Ligand binder design. Structure first.
Ligand SMILES: NC(=O)c1ccc[n+]([C@@H]2O[C@H](COP(=O)([O-])OP(=O)(O)OC[C@H]3O[C@@H](n4cnc5c(N)ncnc54)[C@H](OP(=O)(O)O)[C@@H]3O)[C@@H](O)[C@H]2O)c1
Ligand SMILES: Nc1nc(=O)c2nc(CNc3ccc(C(=O)N[C@@H](CCC(=O)O)C(=O)O)cc3)cnc2[nH]1
Length: 159
């Protein structure tokens, strides 16, 4: 199956010109936890933002051009990306906006972190219809000494 994972501020804002204005180590731990040992598909901008291969995962980067880093796998279409993942239980799509919109119709599961941050950005998570998804897990966390905002983890499965 194909899954998306993302951190969403209010209005599904997912990305800005620069790094998001929050310190959320617990969310990064959730991200690692749910992606380790699985192929991860990302767009070139997200690859550049991360700045290195994510360890312990097969990193697959979408770009229309040949790759510029031989440590990771580079593909030029959604179907090539999927094929490059091989026979695995779960493919993780980790963004960014362009990539999320392409994969959402193919996806069976969403891993979302809802962040109580009323911020502005240039990249959003695609619209999804709550009636087409069953929420199977939810977990709230307040802001604390190590996390700048309150965050709520959710897992949704497509009906
Ligand atoms: N809040 C979160 O959880 C989260 C997660 C990931 C990223 N982000 C944020 O998202 C932003 C990036 O999103 P974005 O939409 O700008 O970029 P993106 O989706 O990361 O990358 C876009 C690039 O991917 C390539 N691409 C996408 N689809 C393709 C296809 N079908 N065939 C070939 N190439 C394809 C293209 O590369 P070429 O131009 O080389 O052809 C394209 O320019 C950043 O601000 C980042 O911080 C947020
Ligand atoms: N929930 C969620 N939160 C995010 O911050 C997030 N970010 C991306 C894209 N950006 C990033 C940026 C950095 C790292 C990263 O460095 N991750 C490390 C753990 C963090 C750490 O080392 O402190 C990792 O191994 O996964 C991952 C994804 C995709 N989906 C997301 N989904």
């Amino acid at each position: 199956m194909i899954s998306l994972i993302a951190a969403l501020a209010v209005d599904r804002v997912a990305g800005m010109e620069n790094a998001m204005p929050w310190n959320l180590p617990a969310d990064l731990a959730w991200f690692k936890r749910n992606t380790l040992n699985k192929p991860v598909i990302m767009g070139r901008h997200t690859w550049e933002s991360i700045g290195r291969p994510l360890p312990g995962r097969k990193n697959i980067i979408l770009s229309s051009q040949p790759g510029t880093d031989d440590r990771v796998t580079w593909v030029k279409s959604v179907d090539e990306a999927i094929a490059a993942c091989g026979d695995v239980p779960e493919i993780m799509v980790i963004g960014g906006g362009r990539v999320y919109e392409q994969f959402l119709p193919k996806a069976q599961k969403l891993y979302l972190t809802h962040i109580d941050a009323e911020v502005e950005g240039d990249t959003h998570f695609p619209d999804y219809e709550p009636d087409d998804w069953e929420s199977v897990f939810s977990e709230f966390h307040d802001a604390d000494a190590q996390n700048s905002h309150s965050y709520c983890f959710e897992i949704l499965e497509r009906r």
